[PDB]
Amino acid sequence: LPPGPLENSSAKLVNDEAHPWKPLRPGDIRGPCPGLNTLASHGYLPRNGVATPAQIINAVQEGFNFDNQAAIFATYAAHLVDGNLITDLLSIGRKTRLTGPDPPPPASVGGLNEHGTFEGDASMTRGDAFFGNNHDFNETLFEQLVDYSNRFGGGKYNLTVAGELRFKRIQDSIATNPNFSFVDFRFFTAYGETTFPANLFVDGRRDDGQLDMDAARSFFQFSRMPDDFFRAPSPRSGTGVEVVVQAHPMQPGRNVGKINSYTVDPTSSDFSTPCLMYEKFVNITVKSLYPNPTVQLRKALNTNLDFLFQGVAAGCTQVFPYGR
Ligand code: HEM
Ligand SMILES: *[C@@H]1O[C@H](CO)[C@@H](O)[C@H](O)[C@H]1NC(C)=O
Ligand SMILES: *[C@@H]1O[C@H](CO)[C@@H](O)[C@H](O)[C@H]1NC(C)=O
Ligand SMILES: *[C@@H]1O[C@H](CO)[C@@H](O)[C@H](O)[C@H]1NC(C)=O
Ligand SMILES: *[C@@H]1O[C@H](CO)[C@@H](O)[C@H](O)[C@H]1NC(C)=O
Ligand SMILES: *[C@@H]1O[C@H](CO)[C@@H](O)[C@H](O)[C@H]1NC(C)=O
Numbered sequence: 001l002p003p004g005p006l007e008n009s010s011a012k013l014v015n016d017e018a019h020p021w022k023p024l025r026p027g028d029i030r031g032p033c034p035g036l037n038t039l040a041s042h043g044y045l046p047r048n049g050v051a052t053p054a055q056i057i058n059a060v061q062e063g064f065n066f067d068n069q070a071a072i073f074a075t076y077a078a079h080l081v082d083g084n085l086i087t088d089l090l091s092i093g094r095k096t097r098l099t100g101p102d103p104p105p106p107a108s109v110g111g112l113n114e115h116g117t118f119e120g121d122a123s124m125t126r127g128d129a130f131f132g133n134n135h136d137f138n139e140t141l142f143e144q145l146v147d148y149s150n151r152f153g154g155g156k157y158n159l160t161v162a163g164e165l166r167f168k169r170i171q172d173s174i175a176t177n178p179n180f181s182f183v184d185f186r187f188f189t190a191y192g193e194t195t196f197p198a199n200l201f202v203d204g205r206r207d208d209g210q211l212d213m214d215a216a217r218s219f220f221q222f223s224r225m226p227d228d229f230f231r232a233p234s235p236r237s238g239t240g241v242e243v244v245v246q247a248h249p250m251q252p253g254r255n256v257g258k259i260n261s262y263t264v265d266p267t268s269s270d271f272s273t274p275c276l277m278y279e280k281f282v283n284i285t286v287k288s289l290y291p292n293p294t295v296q297l298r299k300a301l302n303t304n305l306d307f308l309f310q311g312v313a314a315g316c317t318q319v320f321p322y323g324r
C-alpha cells in the first residue's frame, strides 16, 4: 500500500548518524533525479539505487518532506512506465537485471534513465537524450544554473531564477535538438522540477526559497546533503510553479525532425487540462507499454493504477484501461 503522510512533519536534522553520506560502490545506480540520488546516497533508500514504490514514498517524505499526494503520483507514474510491476522494483537510474525478470516488449523496464517515459528534455543540469547522456550531472549546465542564479537571484537559486532558466533550457533545446519533445507528462514535470531546489534543498530552518550554490552543487552533483542539513518544515513539492510559468508561458509542442521547428501539439494536455494529462498517461503511455498483458501483469497494472489515482488531484475521474 502507498504510505500515508508523515505523523510529524517538522523540520529536523536529516543528515544524521543513521543516514550518513557514502560514496558509490561498484554497481550502485544513480540517475536523473537529484532528490532520489541523495536519498540513496544517505541510505534513506537502498544505496544500490533499486527500490520499491513504498520505499521511495517513505524516503522522499522522511528525508525531504515531499508531500504525500505528489510522492504517490510521481512514484507510481515512474513505476508504471520504468519499473518492474511483478517484482515491485524500480531503478532510480539505468536499466538493471536487479529489477528481476522482464515483461514482454514493448515494455522496457528501463529505470528512470529511460528517455520519454518520465525523463525528458530541457532538464536543468542533465543533457537531452539526443546529445548522448540524459542522466549524469553536467558541469557546463550547472555553471549556467550558477550564472542564472548570479543574474536573477543575487547568487542564490530561487523561483525567479527558475523562471528564467526553465525558459533558457527550452529555447536551447529548440535551437539544437531536432528531436526536442515538450508535451504531456514532460511538459508538466519540467515546470514543477524547477521549484524543487527552492522548496526542498533549502535548509528547513530558513525555508526562504533561496538556495546557495554550495548546497546546490552538493545535491545536484554529489547526491549529498550539506553538513547539518535540516529538511523543510512542512510537506510540499511544487509550490510557486505559477511564478515559473508566468515568467515565460509556453505551449506544449515539439521540434519536427529539425532544429527551430517547434510546433504546438493541440492533442497535448497543458496546465488548463490537468485531468487530460492523467488520462493520456494511463490510456496512451501505460497502455502502449502493456497493450495485452497476461493475468499476473494485468493484476499488477490495475493495483498500481489504483495507487496512481490516489495521487491525482481531486476533481478528476479515474480511467480503467484494463477494465475494473
Ligand atoms: C517522489 C518520487 C520522485 C521520482 C520518481 C523522481 C523522478 C525524477 C525523474 C525521472 C526526473 C528526471 C526529469 C528530467 O528529465 O529532468 C526528475 C527530475 C528532478 N527531480 Fe525528481 N523524483 C522524485 C522526487 C523528487 C524529490 C523529492 C526531489 C527533491 C527533494 C526531486 C528533485 C528533482 C530535480 C531537481 C529534478 C530536475 C533535475 C534537473 O533538471 O537537472 N525529485 N525526478
Ligand atoms: C515532532 O518532531 C520534532 C522534531 O524532531 C519534535 O521536537 C516535536 O516535539 C515532535 N512532535 C510531536 C507531537 O511529537
Ligand atoms: C526522439 O523523440 C521520440 C518521441 O517524439 C522518442 O520516442 C525518442 O526516444 C527520442 N529520442 C531521442 C534520442 O531523443
Ligand atoms: C554537457 O552539456 C554541454 C552543454 O549543452 C554539452 O556541450 C556537453 O557535451 C555535455 N556533456 C559534458 C560531458 O560536458
Ligand atoms: C530571487 O532573488 C532576487 C535577488 O535577491 C530577488 O530580486 C527576487 O525577488 C528573488 N525571487 C524570489 C521568488 O524569491
Ligand atoms: C481513456 O479511456 C477511457 C475508457 O476507458 C475513456 O473514457 C476516456 O475518454 C479516455 N481518455 C482519453 C484522454 O483518451
Ligand SMILES: C=Cc1ccccc1
Pocket (backbone or CB within 6 Å): 033, 070, 074, 188, 189, 190, 192, 193, 196
Ligand atoms: C522530480 C520528479 C518529479 C516528481 C513529481 C513531478 C515532477 C517531477
Ligand SMILES: [Cl-]
Pocket (backbone or CB within 6 Å): 005, 006, 066, 067, 068, 069, 235
Ligand atoms: Cl503530505
Ligand SMILES: [Mg+2]
Pocket (backbone or CB within 6 Å): 032, 119, 120, 121, 122, 123, 126, 127, 128, 134
Ligand atoms: Mg531530462
